[PDB]
């Protein structure tokens, strides 16, 4: 749940693509079947993270809490929303929410990875 100095990768999957209708065959995220059906409001209100990695194993009773993300190097920090869990080593199904916001002066893009700190946080929506 609490990992620091993480040599993080940047696999930011692309939600928006299909208005978050994850139900769409080829995608099907953990809560897709339940969440894809929520009116655009909540869905877009916050960002989006189908989460993955090594530390922070939270799949089952996870689709309800948030993941806080900070970049010590620049000071950039945001609150993420744990929606799904992947098994191939990504990070999040962002594209526009965490990386795309806490990206630095291109470092992240120039390398394909960065060093961050993330802690599980409850957003109690």
Domain boundaries, the chain: 1-125
Length of the chain: 125
Pairwise CA distance, residues 70 & 77, whole Å: 4
Domain 1-125, what fold?
Barwin-like endoglucanases (2.40.40)
Residue 55 CB partners (closer than 8 Å, separation 6+): 3, 6
Q: Round to whole Å and give the CA distance between 117 and 88.
A: 20
In this structure, the strands spanning 76-85 and 113-121 are unpaired
Method: NMR
DSSP state of 3: E
Residue 62: helix, strand or coil by DSSP? helix
């Amino acid at each position: 749940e609490q990992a620091n100095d993480v040599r993080a990768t940047y696999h930011y999957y692309r939600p928006a693509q299909n208005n978050w209708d994850l139900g769409a065959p080829a995608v099907s995220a953990y809560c897709a079947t339940w969440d894809a059906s929520k009116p655009l409001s909540w869905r877009s209100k916050y960002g989006w993270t189908a989460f993955c990695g090594p530390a922070g194993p939270r799949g089952q009773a996870a689709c309800g809490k948030c993941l806080r993300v900070t970049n010590p190097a620049t000071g950039a920090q945001i609150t993420a929303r744990i929606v799904d869990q992947c098994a191939n080593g990504g990070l999040d199904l962002d594209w526009d929410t965490v990386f795309t916001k806490i990206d630095t002066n291109g470092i992240g893009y120039q390398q394909g990875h960065l060093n961050v700190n993330y802690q599980f946080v409850d957003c109690r929506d």
